[PDB]
Amino acid sequence: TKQHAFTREDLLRCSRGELFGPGNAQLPAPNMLMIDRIVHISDVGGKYGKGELVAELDINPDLWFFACHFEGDPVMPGCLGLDAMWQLVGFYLGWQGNPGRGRALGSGEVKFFGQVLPTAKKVTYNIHIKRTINLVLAIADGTVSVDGREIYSAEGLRVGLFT
Amino acid sequence: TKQHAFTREDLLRCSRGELFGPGNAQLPAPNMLMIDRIVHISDVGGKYGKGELVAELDINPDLWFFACHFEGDPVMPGCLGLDAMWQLVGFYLGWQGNPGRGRALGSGEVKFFGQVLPTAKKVTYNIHIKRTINLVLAIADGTVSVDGREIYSAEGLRVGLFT
Ligand SMILES: O=C(O)c1ccc(COc2ccc(F)c(Cl)c2)o1
Numbered sequence: 001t002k003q004h005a006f007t008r009e010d011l012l013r014c015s016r017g018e019l020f021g022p023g024n025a026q027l028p029a030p031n032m033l034m035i036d037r038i039v040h041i042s043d044v045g046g047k048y049g050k051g052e053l054v055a056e057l058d059i060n061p062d063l064w065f066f067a068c069h070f071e072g073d074p075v076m077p078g079c080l081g082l083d084a085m086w087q088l089v090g091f092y093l094g095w096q097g098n099p100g101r102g103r104a105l106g107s108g109e110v111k112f113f114g115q116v117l118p119t120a121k122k123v124t125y126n127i128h129i130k131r132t133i134n135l136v137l138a139i140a141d142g143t144v145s146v147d148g149r150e151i152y153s154a155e156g157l158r159v160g161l162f163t
Numbered sequence: 164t165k166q167h168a169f170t171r172e173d174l175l176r177c178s179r180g181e182l183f184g185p186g187n188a189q190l191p192a193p194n195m196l197m198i199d200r201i202v203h204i205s206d207v208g209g210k211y212g213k214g215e216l217v218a219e220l221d222i223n224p225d226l227w228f229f230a231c232h233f234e235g236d237p238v239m240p241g242c243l244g245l246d247a248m249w250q251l252v253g254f255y256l257g258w259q260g261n262p263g264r265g266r267a268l269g270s271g272e273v274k275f276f277g278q279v280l281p282t283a284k285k286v287t288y289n290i291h292i293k294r295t296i297n298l299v300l301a302i303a304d305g306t307v308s309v310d311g312r313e314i315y316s317a318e319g320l321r322v323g324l325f326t
């Protein structure tokens with residue numbers, strides 16, 4: 001609840017279990033980590049007054065997923081932008097000090113109506129916490145934007161912690 | 164419509180653009196390809212009489228995503244099992260002979276209620292085509308199973324081809 005932004009090094013520390021400590025929420029390490037920094041996190045405000053995350057991923061043409069997805073037609077997998085939103089909701093639950101390992105539990109409607117090309121500069125994630133329930137889980141809405149343009153929406157993202 | 168099963172080599176050929184030809188549907192190449200084989204594909208039968216895919220991914224402890232997701236807590240990313248279902252619906256649209264590049268457009272409800280651990284042997288995907296629309300797109304329901312046990316469901320998977 002004290003720290004409201006996180007550098008890449010903080011997120012890498014998180015991925016090693018060294019931010020929330022052993023048995024608690026971990027981000028993936030590269031190459032599954034789909035966030036470079038958390039610009040903002042809070043447990044108040046946002047769309048529902050239950051908190052907000054703003055996070056960023058820098059794009060360059062050499063990110064691994066461009067070469068294989070697809071050959072001659074590079075586009076950041078939609079599933080990985082979706083996963084960034086699950087990664088962030090899991091981070092939020094750990095950041096609130098809850099114990100346990102994070103799992104995505106699913107979502108309501110997901111829409112992909114644009115793409116991240118290797119010519120893009122920056123992807124921004126906006127997460128609005130809707131509800132937490134203490135079987136500890138969070139429900140959230142999320143958007144993915146590239147260089148100012150909204151391209152994905154997700155309603156009812158669900159993440160749980162397992163102890 | 165003639166070939167009803169596909170080996171890993173066929174899928175790798177598909178990823179290089181060499182199965183449906185240039186500008187048509189491509190699977191991802193490794194390490195984004197989340198299918199080893201298509202056991203069955205048809206444009207008739209399934210839950211809605213509009214066709215079915217059955218596909219498999221062999222699991223071993225050395226698959227790349229176990230090491231980074233998460234460190235000390237290996238589990239196949241749910242987002243990649245979801246992506247296998249988008250990959251298969253895209254394959255179906257190309258297999259029917261439609262032109263254009265594949266994009267996931269989203270889904271209705273996704274649920275993850277189990278996990279793929281590095282001790283699992285085989286993941287099976289079952290896709291039921293619900294509807295196609297000719298702006299060419301397919302709508303489908305999907306399940307992910309590990310060693311006989313259903314663990315994920317997705318309703319209203321959507322994939323489109325872009326010409
Ligand atoms: O991994 C994918 O399939 C993926 C990433 C992003 C998308 C969506 O692609 C597009 C791309 C352009 C469009 F206009 C629309 Cl309606 C969707 O699909």
Ligand SMILES: O=C(O)c1ccc(COc2ccc(F)c(Cl)c2)o1
Binds near residue numbers: 086238240242276278
């Ligand atoms: O990438 C993930 O977060 C991921 C993959 C699979 C899952 C779901 O994990 C579980 C694992 C055990 C359970 F009992 C439930 Cl209801 C969900 O989450």
